[PDB]
């Protein structure tokens, strides 16, 4: 279950330095649940040569 | 007797009357390559035939 997507790196609002520092913010490329059927297209070797 | 117009005494009005042969010619940018030496068994094609 290795996909390719166009997602951006998150940039927080940073309205306070100390409040943002007390919480823990980070970003992954590992997602929670896999995407739906109608939003993924399947690619083979054969359809890529075509 | 040959029945072939080899030598004809013609006037100078019809010296350029033989210009009736159509010709086609390629431009100076085109290339004409040899492809019949590229027929080997271990070569696959991207979109397969019937």
Structure tokens at B27: 């431009």
Q: How was this structure determined?
A: cryo-EM
Handedness of CA A32, A37, A40, A46 (dihedral sign): positive
Distances (CA, A) of A14 to A7, A25, B8, B12, B45: 21, 11, 101, 97, 55
For residue B44, give the chain A residue with the closest CA.
A49
CA A25-A29-A32 angle, to 5 degrees, is 85
Distance from CA of A41 to the nearest CA of B (A): 20
Distance from CA of B50 to the nearest CA of A (A): 14
């Amino acid at each position: 279950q290795v996909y390719m997507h166009r997602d951006m790196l998150p940039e927080p609002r940073l309205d306070d330095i100390e409040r943002f520092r007390q919480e823990g913010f980070y970003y992954t490329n590992m997602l929670e649940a896999p995407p739906e059927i109608d939003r993924v297209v399947q690619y083979t070797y054969e359809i890529a040569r075509l | 007797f040959i029945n072939k117009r080899i030598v004809e005494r013609v006037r100078v009005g019809q010296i350029l009357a033989v210009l009736n042969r159509r010709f086609v010619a390629y431009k100076g940018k085109m290339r004409i390559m040899d492809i019949t030496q590229s027929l080997k068994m271990g070569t696959k094609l991207a979109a397969p035939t019937v």
